Amino acid sequence: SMQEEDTFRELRIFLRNVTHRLAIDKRFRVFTKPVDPDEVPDYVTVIKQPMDLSSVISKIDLHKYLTVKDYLRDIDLICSNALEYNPDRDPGDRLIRHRACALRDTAYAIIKEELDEDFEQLCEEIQESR
């Protein structure tokens, strides 16, 4: 229905805004674009499902997220990929893991404060009906 399409458009607007706020945070610069294979040649071999905030925006725009839960799975993926690819005690790895955890926690915190639970429940119910 057109009311349903209006719901999903509102979702997309909300998600772009959260994603923009994450993307402009200097701590998260490393997560804003896909990994450069020149710079990191084995990345695309080790990490099976690369994700980054530019790709998140492309997916919002492609109507691939019908719920905040689906969006959060991709935020989670950005984080788990970083924990998997940089697991060492070395300070570079530890820095990127900290930042990955901060990205995830920040996204969850924004969503906890700003997403109405009934809005999300509506999205989920429309999704389940299709």
Ligand X SMILES: Cc1c[nH]c(=O)[nH]c1=O
H-assigned helices in the chain: 2-23, 43-46, 53-61, 68-85, 91-114, 117-128
Closest distance to ligand X from the beta carbon of 110 (Å): 21
CB of 121 to ligand X, least distance (A): 34
Residues that bind ligand X (CB under 6 A): 30, 35, 40, 82, 85-86, 96
Here the tokens at position 126 are: 């429309």
Q: Which residue has the closest beta carbon to ligand X? A: 85
Cβ distance to ligand X smaller for residue 50 or 70? 50
Q: How far is the CB of 78 from ligand X (least distance, A)?
A: 8
* Number of Cβ atoms within 10 Å of the Cβ of 119: 15
